[PDB]
Amino acid sequence: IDLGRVIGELIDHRKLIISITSVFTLFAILYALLATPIYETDALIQIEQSAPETALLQSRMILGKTIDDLNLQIQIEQKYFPVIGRGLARLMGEKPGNIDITRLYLPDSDDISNNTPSIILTVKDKENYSINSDGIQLNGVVGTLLNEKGISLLVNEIDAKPGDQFVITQLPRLKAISDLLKSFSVADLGKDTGMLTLTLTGDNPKRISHILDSISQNYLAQNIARQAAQDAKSLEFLNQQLPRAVYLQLLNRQQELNIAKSSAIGNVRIIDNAVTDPNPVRPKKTIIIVIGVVLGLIVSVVLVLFQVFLRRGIESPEQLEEIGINVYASIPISEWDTLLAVGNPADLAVEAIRGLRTSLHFAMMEAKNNVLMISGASPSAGMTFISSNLAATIAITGKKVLFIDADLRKGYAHKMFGHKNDKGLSEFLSGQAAAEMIIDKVEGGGFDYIGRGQIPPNPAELLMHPRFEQLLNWASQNYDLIIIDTPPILAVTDAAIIGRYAGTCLLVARFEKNTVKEIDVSMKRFEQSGVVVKGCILNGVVKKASSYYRYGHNHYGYS
Amino acid sequence: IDLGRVIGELIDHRKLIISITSVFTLFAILYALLATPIYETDALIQIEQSAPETALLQSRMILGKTIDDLNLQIQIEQKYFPVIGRGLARLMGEKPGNIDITRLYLPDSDDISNNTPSIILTVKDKENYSINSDGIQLNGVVGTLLNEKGISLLVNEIDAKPGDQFVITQLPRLKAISDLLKSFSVADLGKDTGMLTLTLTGDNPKRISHILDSISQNYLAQNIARQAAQDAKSLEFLNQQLPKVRAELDSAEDKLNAYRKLNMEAKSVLDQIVNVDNQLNELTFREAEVSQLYTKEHPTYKALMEKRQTLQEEKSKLNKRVSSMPSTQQEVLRLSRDVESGRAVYLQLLNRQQELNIAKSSAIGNVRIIDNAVTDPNPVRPKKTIIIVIGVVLGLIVSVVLVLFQVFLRRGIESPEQLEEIGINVYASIPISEWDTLLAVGNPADLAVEAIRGLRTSLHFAMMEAKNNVLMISGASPSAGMTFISSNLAATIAITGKKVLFIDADLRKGYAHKMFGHKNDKGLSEFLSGQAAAEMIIDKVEGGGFDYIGRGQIPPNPAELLMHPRFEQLLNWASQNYDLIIIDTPPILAVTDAAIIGRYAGTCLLVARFEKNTVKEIDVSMKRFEQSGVVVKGCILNGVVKKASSYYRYGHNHYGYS
Ligand SMILES: Nc1ncnc2c1ncn2[C@@H]1O[C@H](COP(=O)(O)OP(=O)(O)O)[C@@H](O)[C@H]1O
Ligand SMILES: Nc1ncnc2c1ncn2[C@@H]1O[C@H](COP(=O)(O)OP(=O)(O)O)[C@@H](O)[C@H]1O
Ligand SMILES: [Mg+2]
Ligand SMILES: [Mg+2]
C-alpha cells in the first residue's frame, strides 16, 4: 500500500464517507440545538481555614434550611410530550410558561417504587385551572385554597397561555436536598485564602441566583449566630448572676456583652452576591459538532479499511496474467430482452466485444475445427451475454454463425432472440426430432440458433450421446463459426462434456465477483477432464480510482 | 494468519461465541438482579486532633454500648429456602416482613462448634405464633412473655403474612460488635479539620440510620457526661463500693469453697437467673444515666421501665421454679447465684470505673451533631452496569480463547490444495448430501450426485490407457466414503448405457447387499471358498441398472481367501462381459485386503474424508499401497462443507445451478 492506493480508496468510497459523516454531524447538530441550556451562577465569600467551611456549606443543615425557605420541594415541569418538544419549542421562540405555588400536599401514596406523588395541572385561562392525578378531574381557582380528595393546593400568578400542562411533584425533602447538592459546588481558589467561590448550575437563570443568595445568607446568619453564642451565654449567665461597685461593674460588663452580641460580625463575609452568567455553560455547541465530525470521519475510515481488506475479487487482468491465464478482453458495464449488439451497436461494451472478435480471429487459427465454447466459473458471470453478442458482431462481417445454447438447465436464449420454443437441442438429443427442425433465425441478428428446448431430467447424460457429436460434425460443414453456450463448470459438469468437441474454449470471469483462485480451479478442472482452455475474458469492468493509482485507465471513449 | 483468516474463523464459530456470551451475560444479569441491595447512611459531627477520636469511635467500648442499647445481638432472618428466594421475592413485589423482639434468651447449648443457638418462628396470625428449636413445638402470643424449657422469648408487633418463617439467633456479643465494626467507618474529610464523617452500610435502610444515630448520640453523651462528671460524686461513689463489693465477692467465694469441701435444670435456671441479674444491674445503670441526661416521658425511658417489668416477671418465674426443687439443689443454686452475681457485678463496676476514668481524660469540648444519619435510597451495591459489562467481556474473551484453541488443534484436511502440494491428484470434491437407499437413485438432482458426475467425467479420461477395465476404490480410515462413492459412481455410470459390475470385496463389514436389496445366499465368499459358481453370485440392483456381487457370509479368513486364484479367474471372466468393474475394499491402514485386491485392478483411487483424515495419513496410505506393488492413481476428497475461512483463504469452489 502507498499514498496512491489510499487516495484511490477514499475517492472510490466517497459516497459512503459523505453519507456517514453527514448523518453523524446531523445528529450532533440536532443534539446541540435541542439540549436544554444550563446556566451557571457564582458568588464570592470571604473568610477571615476554608477546609471545614466547605463541608459545612454542603451539609444537610444549610441546604435543608434553604429547601424549607424557598419551597424547593415543589417541582414544576411544563409538559411537552416528546424528548424534543422542549428544544423545538425554545427554538420556535415561545417563552416558557411558569406558575407560582406556595402550598402543596398530595395524599402521599408512597408505594414500593413511586416515592414521589405527582399530578398534572392544565391551564384554562389566567385564573382557573384543572387538576388530575390518576384521572380524577378537579377544578381550582387562583387565590382560594383547595382541600379536596386528600389534596391541598394553592397556585398563584399563573403566567402561561391556555392549554399548557404542568407536571407537579412534591419530591421528598431528602431528594430535594440531594438534587440541590448535586448542582452546588464550592472551591477555595487559593488553597489558603479566605476566598470561596460558590457555584450553582441550573436551567432557570433567575431561580438559581435566588437559591444561591438564600444559601449564602443562611450560612452567614448561622455563622454570626455561632459567633454571638458565646457572648449571649455569658450575658445570660450575668443576668442569672445579678443579685454596689460590683453591681455597676456587672452592669458595664452586661452592656459590653450586649454590644458584642448585637454586632457579632463573624469571620465570614459576602463579597459577591450571586449573578447568573447569561451564556449557558452547556451544551457546548462547537465541541459537540467537532466531536461529531471527527467521529464520523474515523467511523467512515475504519469501515473503508474493513471493506478494502475483505475484498477478494478480481481487480484487473494483471492478476489473471500473473498466474499464466491469457485475458483476451475486458468488457465494461453497459448501462444502456434484446441483444445489445443490435439495440445500441455504438455502445462501449460492443466495442470491447469487437476487440475480442479481433483477438479471436487470430487465436482461432491452427485450431482443430471451427467450434468455440464459452464457459465460466460461476453463474451470472456474462457467458450468455458475451456469447450472444459475440455471435452478433461476428455475423455482421458477412460470416455464417451458429449459436447453440447447450445450457439445458436455465437457458433463455430463445426468449432473447424471439422464439418458436418447440424442438430445441433436447428434442434432438433424445431422438424425437431432426437436425433440420431445431435451427431458427434471429430477427435483428443474422445468425442461426438452436435453443435448449424443454428442460430434460437428465441433462448431463443427454450430452454424452453421439448424436451431439453428429450434430457438431454436420454443422461444422455448413457454418463458418459455431458458438456453444454452456453452464458453469464449478456448478455442473456439462461444460467439460461439451468441451471435448470444441476446438477453442474460453472462460468468462466476472470483474468483482469471481476470484483468481476460483478461475485457477476452473481451468484445472477443465484440463483434468481432457479440455484445454485457451484463455479468459474479464467482464463487467468499472472504472475505479484505486485501479488508476495501481494499474491505469485501460479504456477510453472515442466518438 | 491475517484479517481474512481470523474473520473467517469468527464467522464459522459464530454459534459457539454467541451461545457462550449469552450464557455469561445471563448469569451476570441474574446475579445483578438477585443480589441483596446494600444501602449506606452517613452523619456529620463537629469536634473542637481527630486522630484519637477516629480510633476511640471504633473501639469495643462505644460499639458495645450501642449493641447493648439496641439489642443488636438478636439476629432475625426471614426464611427463603433456596439461595435465590430472597431476590425473586423482592422482585415479585412482596414486601419483606419483620418482627420486633425485645427479650431473647436461648438455653445456650454452647457445644464445640454451634456457638450461636438458633430457633425458627412461624407466624400463624397477627397475634399468635409458633416456635421450634429442635422439633419441640411451642405456641406463643404477642405481648405475654414465654418462659419454657429454659427459653425466654418476647415478641411485639408481628408484621408479616401467615405462613412466614424466621430464623432467630442470639449471636455472641463480640460477634455482634465485629459485624457492626466491619461495615462502619469514620473519616475526617479534611485530614486536619474538626469535621468527622461517619458512615455505615447495611441491607436495611431504616435500621442502619437508627444504629448510626445511636452511635453519634452515645459519643455526644459520653463527652457531655464527662464535662458534667467533674463535680459529680459518681467517681468517689464507685471508689467506695468497689472494695465493699470485692469483700462481699471474697466472702461468697470462701463460703462456696467451704461448702464444696450438677442437675441440668439446676444449672439452667442458675445461668438464667445470672443473666436476669446482669440485665437488671445494667438496666439500673442505664436508667440512672438516661434519667440524668433525658426525660421520663422520653420513649427510651418508657422502654427501660417496660424491660424492667419484663425482667422482674422473668425473675419471679425463675424464683417460683427454684422454690419447687429439692433443698440440696437450691442450696448449691444459691451458692452459685451469690458467686456469679458477685463476680459479674465486680466486672461491671470495673468497666464503669474504666469508662469514667477514660472519659475524664478527654480533651475535647462539647460535641456538636451537625447532620444526623439519613439513608441514601439508591443502593451502593451491587453495581449492576459494571457487573453486566464484566460479564459481557468475560464471555467474549473466553469464547475467543476457545476458538483459538480449536483452530490451533485442528489437523484435518481443509482443501484439495493441501493434498495437491504433496503431489496427490484430487479428482473430485463430493459435498455433504443432507438429503439404506442409493443417493444417485432417490435424489438424482442432488449436489453430491453432481459432484459424482464430475468425478465420472474425470475418470472417463483417467482410465484410458489402463491395462484393463477394473477400478478399485479404497481409503485410509473406515467410514470415509468408499462404499458411498463406489455405489453412487456405479449408479451414475450405469445410466449412460454402459454395463457395470459392482463387487463388494469387503468381506468383513460390507453392507452393499442390504443397500441394494439382497439375496444374501452365494456372495463372494462362497465363490472363493469353492462352494459356489461364477453365475450364481451375480445379482441385479432394483433402481440401479448394474449388477452386484455381495460379500456373502463373513469368512473367518478374509485376507487368505482373496489370494486364492479363483478371485483372478472371476475378474478375468467378468472383464470380458462388462464395460466397467468397481471393487469396494476395506481401508488400507486397518487391514491388508485392499493391497491384495489391488494387484488385479487397473486403476486405484483413495477416498479422503474432509475434516477427519490428515495429509500425512493419505501420504502413508499411498506409500503403503505403492510398497506392495499397487500404483494409486489419485485421491477423491469427500464430505466437503462450505466455510468462511476457506473462502478468505481459497474461494467458493462449488455452486448450485437449477
Ligand atoms: N457487461 C454487462 N453489461 C450489462 N449487463 C450484463 C453484462 N454482463 C452480463 N450482463 C447482464 O447480467 C445478467 C447475467 O448475465 P448472463 O450471461 O445472462 O448469466 P450466465 O453467465 O450465468 O449465463 C444478464 O441479465 C446480463 O444481461
Ligand atoms: N458425501 C456424503 N454425504 C452424506 N453421507 C455420506 C457421504 N459420504 C459417506 N456418507 C455416509 O456416511 C456413512 C459412512 O460411509 P461408508 O462409505 O459406508 O463407510 P466405509 O467407507 O468405511 O465403507 C455412510 O452411512 C454414508 O452413507
Ligand atoms: Mg447462461
Ligand atoms: Mg465400505
Author numbering:
A (entry chain B): 17 to 64, 85 to 279, 385 to 477, 494 to 716
B (entry chain A): 17 to 64, 85 to 297, 304 to 477, 494 to 716
Authors' account:
Here, we report the characterisation of the structures WzcK540M2YE (Y718E, Y717E), WzcK540M3YE (Y718E, Y717E and Y715E) and WzcK540M3YE_N711Y (an additional N711Y mutation) corresponding to different phosphorylation states. When Y715 occupies the active site (1pY), Y713 is bound in the same pocket. The structural and MD data reported here confirm this hypothesis, showing that the tyrosine most stably positioned at the active site is the one immediately N-terminal to the phosphotyrosine (or the engineered Tyr-to-Glu mutation). We show that it is binding of the i-2 tyrosine to the tyrosine pocket (where i is the number of the residue positioned at the kinase active site) orders the tail between the tyrosine at the active site and helix α23. The presence of the negatively charged E675 in the tyrosine pocket we suggest is incompatible with binding a negatively charged phosphorylated tyrosine (or glutamic acid side chain). During the progressive phosphorylation sequence, the kinase domain is a rigid body. Structural alignment of the kinase domains of monomers of the full-length protein reveals increasing tilting of the transmembrane and periplasmic regions. When the octamer is viewed from the periplasm to the cytoplasm, progressive phosphorylation results in a clockwise rotation of transmembrane and periplasmic regions relative to the kinase ring. The movement of helix α1 is directly transmitted to transmembrane helix α2 and then to the periplasmic domain and, in this way, the phosphorylation signal from the cytoplasm is coupled to the periplasm.
Wzc, an integral cytoplasmic membrane tyrosine autokinase protein serves as the master regulator of the biosynthesis and export of many bacterial capsular polysaccharides and exopolysaccharides. Wzc comprises a large periplasmic domain, two transmembrane helices and a C-terminal cytoplasmic kinase domain with a tyrosine-rich tail. Wzc regulates polymerisation functions through cycling the formation and dissociation of an octameric complex, driven by changes in the phosphorylation status of the tyrosine-rich tail. E. coli Wzc serves a model for a wider family of polysaccharide co-polymerases.
